[PDB]
Amino acid sequence: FVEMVDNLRGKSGQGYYVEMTVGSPPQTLNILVDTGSSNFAVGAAPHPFLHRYYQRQLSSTYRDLRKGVYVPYTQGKWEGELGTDLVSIPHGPNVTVRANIAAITESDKFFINGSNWEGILGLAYAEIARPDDSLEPFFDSLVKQTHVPNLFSLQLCGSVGGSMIIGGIDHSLYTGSLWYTPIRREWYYEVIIVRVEINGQDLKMDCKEYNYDKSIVDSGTTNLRLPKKVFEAAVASIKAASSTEFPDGFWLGEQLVCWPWNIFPVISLYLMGEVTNQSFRITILPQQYLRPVDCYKFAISQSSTGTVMGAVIMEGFYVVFDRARKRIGFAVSACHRTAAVEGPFVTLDMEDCGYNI
Numbered sequence: 001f002v003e004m005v006d007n008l009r010g011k012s013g014q015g016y017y018v019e020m021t022v023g024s025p026p027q028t029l030n031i032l033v034d035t036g037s038s039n040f041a042v043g044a045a046p047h048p049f050l051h052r053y054y055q056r057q058l059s060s061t062y063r064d065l066r067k068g069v070y071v072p073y074t075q076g077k078w079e080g081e082l083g084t085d086l087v088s089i090p091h092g093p094n095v096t097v098r099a100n101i102a103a104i105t106e107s108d109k110f111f112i113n114g115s116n117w118e119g120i121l122g123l124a125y126a127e128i129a130r131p132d133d134s135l136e137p138f139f140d141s142l143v144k145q146t147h148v149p150n151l152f153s154l155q156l157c158g159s160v161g162g163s164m165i166i167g168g169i170d171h172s173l174y175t176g177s178l179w180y181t182p183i184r185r186e187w188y189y190e191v192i193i194v195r196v197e198i199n200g201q202d203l204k205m206d207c208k209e210y211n212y213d214k215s216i217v218d219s220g221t222t223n224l225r226l227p228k229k230v231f232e233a234a235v236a237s238i239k240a241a242s243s244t245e246f247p248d249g250f251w252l253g254e255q256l257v258c259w260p261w262n263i264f265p266v267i268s269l270y271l272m273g274e275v276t277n278q279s280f281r282i283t284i285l286p287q288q289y290l291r292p293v294d295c296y297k298f299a300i301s302q303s304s305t306g307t308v309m310g311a312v313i314m315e316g317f318y319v320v321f322d323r324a325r326k327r328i329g330f331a332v333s334a335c336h337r338t339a340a341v342e343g344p345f346v347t348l349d350m351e352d353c354g355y356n357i
Ligand SMILES: CCc1cc(CCN)ccc1O
Pocket: 013, 014, 015, 034, 036, 037, 109, 110, 111, 112, 120, 220, 221
């Protein structure tokens, strides 16, 4: 998979993107890699913020689906026209597939001024695809139409660079062993967190709440995001671990702080393992949750949507999205006190940590 190593670029806080080609002849576009959504959507109009965009008129292979799509966010939104066309990944596998495409014609606060990407590759499952689950996501089309195996992996190295290995795993990208957590349900990449430690001390919370709503692995989000009750407990504990030196706003992400690592505790997430009563842990260094903007932003934040293991978390690990076996694997990244994946551990009643509809 040497063709696929170092195929991700980006800028700090602005996500990771892969080069893709759409239509015939091939239109080259940079596309944000997002494991937290399921739509393939590209700018299709000369928005001022964009370097290039999908020009459908230039494509003989384009087919209109005569239906619109509206994806609102808290921040803003995007809106487009659904169609299908030929898609390739230059630094990916030598195949071409007919995928669904959402041609973005109106957006608000979606594109970033100064970024170098023009679309989003939603890598999650049909269940959360818009308008509904019959809009087959990109990766599904890829698996269905080629011999490419049903899995991919990401190494995000924190401007930024990384690797998306489509159809497999490259062992030169991690050290130690891969450890696997089950995908709880195929919609987002939903996993179950069963224990949290700060430095070495348990938060002693009912584990149901580490997953309140849900917990997900999402390369489109920057921060480590935690449910409100959890974040509260987590911050109070990181405070106590480093009360050697800060304003209340710094923790809420309302202001930066400037200057020194060792006063800051490591963070451990134990994740449900493959075997009954067995877990494993991932450990993140404060080099991950204190992001340079020497002024740092606190890259942990509260959430109303559950835990989000964003790029902050993923940047220390090689993460295997093993769709075929409904699991996600973690190993120490070859590009990351040192970040760690260890096991096995004994954890009882792990199923109770899942929150139910
Ligand atoms: C990097 C910031 C960013 C992230 C996402 C992913 C959200 N599912 C979408 C648009 C955007 O500008």
